[PDB]
Amino acid sequence: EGLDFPEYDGVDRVINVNAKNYKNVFKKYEVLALLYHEPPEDDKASQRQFEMEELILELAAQVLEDKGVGFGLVDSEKDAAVAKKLGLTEEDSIYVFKEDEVIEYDGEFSADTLVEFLLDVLEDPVELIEGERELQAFENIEDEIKLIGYFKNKDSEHYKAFKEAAEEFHPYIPFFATFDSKVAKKLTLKLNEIDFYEAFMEEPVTIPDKPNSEEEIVNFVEEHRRSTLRKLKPESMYETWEDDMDGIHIVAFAEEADPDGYEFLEILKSVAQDNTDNPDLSIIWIDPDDFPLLVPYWEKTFDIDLSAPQIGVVNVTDADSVWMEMDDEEDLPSAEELEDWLEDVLEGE
Numbered sequence: 001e002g003l004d005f006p007e008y009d010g011v012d013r014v015i016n017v018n019a020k021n022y023k024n025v026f027k028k029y030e031v032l033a034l035l036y037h038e039p040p041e042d043d044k045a046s047q048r049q050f051e052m053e054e055l056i057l058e059l060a061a062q063v064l065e066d067k068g069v070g071f072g073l074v075d076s077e078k079d080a081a082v083a084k085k086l087g088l089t090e091e092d093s094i095y096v097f098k099e100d101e102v103i104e105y106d107g108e109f110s111a112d113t114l115v116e117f118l119l120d121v122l123e124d125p126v127e128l129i130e131g132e133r134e135l136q137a138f139e140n141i142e143d144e145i146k147l148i149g150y151f152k153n154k155d156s157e158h159y160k161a162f163k164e165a166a167e168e169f170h171p172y173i174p175f176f177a178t179f180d181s182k183v184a185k186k187l188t189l190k191l192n193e194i195d196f197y198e199a200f201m202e203e204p205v206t207i208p209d210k211p212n213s214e215e216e217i218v219n220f221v222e223e224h225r226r227s228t229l230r231k232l233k234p235e236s237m238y239e240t241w242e243d244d245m246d247g248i249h250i251v252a253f254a255e256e257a258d259p260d261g262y263e264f265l266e267i268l269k270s271v272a273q274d275n276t277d278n279p280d281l282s283i284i285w286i287d288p289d290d291f292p293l294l295v296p297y298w299e300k301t302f303d304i305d306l307s308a309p310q311i312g313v314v315n316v317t318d319a320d321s322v323w324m325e326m327d328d329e330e331d332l333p334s335a336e337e338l339e340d341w342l343e344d345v346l347e348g349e
């Protein structure tokens, strides 16, 4: 007869954002998530799809109520003028506002993913490294791009530029700073130097021409936005998938928590490292564990067993694909064999 776990309470919290209330809504919340959607269609199916999306927002709204995150709906017809002023263009899409930044969310429309994302948005844009714990944590990041700069202190003109740049990419690309010469030494940073670490790469590339303006940093990050090996992540999956390489993606499935999946991931990292300067190569790593609801679809569509590592090439137009044969009674292919296979497949078609 104990206390129940928290449950969705069925109380409506998602705001109908309109001409009359939108200014007040913005004032009330530090972070605001707005779904820009189309007016109700006549067909039951469309209505049910919208009903689901709105309830997903309700769940997130309940979870994040105490943290001052607000959720709202902007109707492209009824609220056309609000959309105009706020720059809402993308049909049935989520926009996130924090102070003077808009984020055009391009990730999974699930309560889990949205809540984690908005919790990340709430955080300060630069992570400072002081302790050994924090430095170690920084060093252990590999599945995303990361930047680290060394500056005199928070009042350095060059640190402020770095923070402005950080805000432009927040919370997708973590920006770290240190003001401690001992930390800078371990990181091999000179004062005002910023090191850019491509995902899954051991060695950073230093942003040239320090000290760097906000624009120099932003330009550099944009030019280096696509890592040679990048992970499909729920928070960013649509942006990653839509960034195809001339109509195809090389896709690798590997369950990191599995011995074979782990070994395969290490091989993919070697392939990446050996081809890092090749701008025509990007491989998407998908860990099936991250996307339980898509595994049946992938297994059916690609005709593969996702309990084993896989690598293939996928046509983004129609999901046509080809997958490398690997005998699970022998060792996984070496990096050289993977590259050879990719060459064979990509030269022919």
Ligand SMILES: *[C@@H]1O[C@H](CO)[C@@H](O[C@@H]2O[C@H](CO)[C@@H](O)[C@H](O)[C@H]2NC(C)=O)[C@H](O)[C@H]1NC(C)=O
Pocket: 247, 248, 315, 316, 317, 318, 320, 349
């Ligand atoms: C990816 O798949 C699509 C088919 O869904 C291919 O597009 C077609 O290509 C053929 C020639 O092979 C054309 O005759 C059709 O008009 C195309 N249909 C379209 C564009 O919808 C496309 O070639 C494939 N990309 C590859 C193989 O790299």
Ligand SMILES: [Ca+2]
Pocket: 015, 016, 017, 018, 073, 074, 075, 079
């Ligand atoms: Ca509205």
Ligand SMILES: [Ca+2]
Pocket: 187, 188, 189, 190
């Ligand atoms: Ca250095």
Ligand SMILES: [Ca+2]
Pocket: 208, 209, 210, 211, 212, 213, 216
């Ligand atoms: Ca400069």
Ligand SMILES: [Ca+2]
Pocket: 198, 227, 228, 275, 276, 277, 278
């Ligand atoms: Ca690279």
Ligand code: NA
Pocket: 120, 171, 172, 173, 174
């Ligand atoms: Na992040």
Ligand code: NA
Pocket: 246, 247, 248, 315, 316, 317, 318
């Ligand atoms: Na295509």
